[PDB]
Structure formats: C-alpha cells, structure tokens
Structure 1
Amino acid sequence: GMSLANQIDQFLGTIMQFAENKHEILLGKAESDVKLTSTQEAILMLLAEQISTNAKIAEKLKISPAAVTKALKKLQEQELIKSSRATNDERVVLWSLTEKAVPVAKEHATHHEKTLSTYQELGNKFTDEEQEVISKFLSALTEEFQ
C-alpha cells in the first residue's frame, strides 16, 4: 500500500505466506530436505567443519551441556553423526558426521549461502548511510515482534 505503514504490513504478509509450511526462510528449491532444530543444525554444520567433543561444542556455540546432549542424541538417532573414542584418552568422546550426512550438510549450507548472498547483493545497492537507516529500521521492527 502507499503509506510506509501499509507497505510494512504488506511485506510481513508476503513473508508469512512464504514461510507457511517451510522449516526456515530460504531462497531456492527448499531442497535441503532434512528438518533439524537450530541447535541440531548448528552442531551438524559445526561437525561438518571439525570433529569435536561435547564441551568443545558447548563452548563454540555458547550453549549448555544439557542442550548439546539433547542435540547429539537426536542427530545420532537419525544416523547423521557418530561417536568415537579419542585416540589419546579413552574417556573423551569425539563426534563426527556419518557418510550419508556429509553431502546433506554441504547441500544445505549452500542453500544458506545462496540466501545470504542474495541479501548481501541487495544490501550492496545502498550506501553505508542508507544501510544504517535500514539497519535501525530492522532492529526497531524486530523489537515489536517479541
């Protein structure tokens, strides 16, 4: 609608219809089939880069042992990750991706990367002063939604 208030309202409407029956907000095929919680997904992506421990994971993603534990449980049940014993210390447990998960992580990261780069490109059309205005607009509108 022509007022900014109306435009803002229509834009949210557009996003709502787009998010309907989707797991995340992504641009593209939505061919990132598997449906993971944010934590599970962060862990998956984290392990896709490096083998790590329960405490290393909690640290890296600034979450509690409880949360890491619950997430590792689920990922393991879905055969996306697998535990193994630290070559140097029988007591410490290492985690990593299963074979079938490696490409699943890759394909789904790309999707995120394509979505981010589209936002980057749109952003690049605006000067720094303009990006600041957009930024202050998004923070303030973000506050209304909690």
Structure 2
Amino acid sequence: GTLEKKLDNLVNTILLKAENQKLTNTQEHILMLLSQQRLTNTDLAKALNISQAAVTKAIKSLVKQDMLAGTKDTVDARVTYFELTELAKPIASEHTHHHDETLNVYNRLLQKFSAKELEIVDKFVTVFAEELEG
C-alpha cells in the first residue's frame, strides 16, 4: 500500500474502465471540441495535447464515417477547418453531457476535503497533470 501503487491502480482503472465499460476518445473529444467552433488539425493537437499525426488519423476516420467535413480558409489555402456533420451532432452532444455529469462526480468527491486540504489536492493533481507527458 505505497501511494505509488495506489496511483498505478487509479490509472489502470481509468484505462480498463474506459476500454470495457466504435469511436475513440480522441475522436469523441475532437467532435466535442469542434461542436463549439471549427478548428485546424493544429488547434486540436494543442487543445487535446496530442500529436498532429494522431489528429490526422482520427480526423480521417471521422471523415470516412461521414462525421466531419473539411473546408479550406479563403485567405490561406494551406489551412483546412473542420466542421461536424449532422450525423455527428447528436454524438457530440451526448458525449458533452456525459462530461457534464462526471464533473458533478468530481465536485461531490472534492467536497469531502477541507478547502486547505484541497490546496494540496490542487497541487498534487497539478504535478500529476503533466508528469504524464513521459
């Protein structure tokens, strides 16, 4: 019962719960992002903290599945912007409020902690935040 182990479990459940429980999470969160405005491959890599290449994989699958449509900027031809299609919009929404609920779960969970206890939680989830880069 080192906290190290507790951490490794926590993450393991996060992965194994997602897995088991057709679109990737990447795909789901791309749709979610493009739900509130259109964006480049590059905004999206930035926003979601992933490779350009990973967006372009997901993007292409989405386009194959009629989810998404690329339409080029009329000042800079290099740039393409993606909109959702009608088929996607129900899907984006559904995922959007799946995420609204998980925030309540997070809120309720955090309520168990004094607001000074929480500054450690904040600190902790913050260093944990991007020690996940490697």
- Shorter-chain TM band: 0.5 to 0.7
- Give unmatched runs, 5+ long, in structure 2: 1-5, 129-134
Question: What letter is aligned with 2:57?
Answer: K
CA distance in structure 2 between the aligned counterparts of 1:74 and 1:99, rounded to whole angstroms? 16
Cα deviation digits, residues 112-141 of structure 1 (max 9, x gap): 11122122023123212444677799899x
Find the counterpart in structure 1 of residue 68 from structure 2: 81
Selected match of 1:56 from 43, 60, 66:
43
Q: Against the structure 1 CA distance between its residues 125 and 36, is the aligned structure 2 distance closer, same or farther, given a 3 Å change threshold?
A: same
Question: What letter is aligned with 2:84?
Answer: L
What TM-score do the two structures reach when normalised by structure 2? 0.67
Question: What letter is aligned with 1:128?
Answer: A
- Give unmatched runs, 5+ long, in structure 1: 1-7, 23-34, 141-146
Matched, 1:118 2:105: yes
Q: CA deviation at 1:56?
A: 2.3
The structure with the greater share of residues assigned to helix is: 2
CA distance in structure 2 between the aligned counterparts of 1:37 and 1:48, rounded to whole angstroms? 16
CA distance in structure 1 between the aligned counterparts of 2:57 and 2:124, rounded to whole angstroms? 36
CA distance in structure 2 between the aligned counterparts of 1:62 and 1:102, rounded to whole angstroms? 23
Moved more, 77-86 or 131-140: 131-140
CA contact (8 A) 2:62 2:68 kept: yes
Count of matched residue pairs: 120
CA distance in structure 2 between the aligned counterparts of 1:133 and 1:85, rounded to whole angstroms? 46
CA distance in structure 2 between the aligned counterparts of 1:59 and 1:132, rounded to whole angstroms? 27
Find the counterpart in structure 1 of residue 27 from structure 2: 40
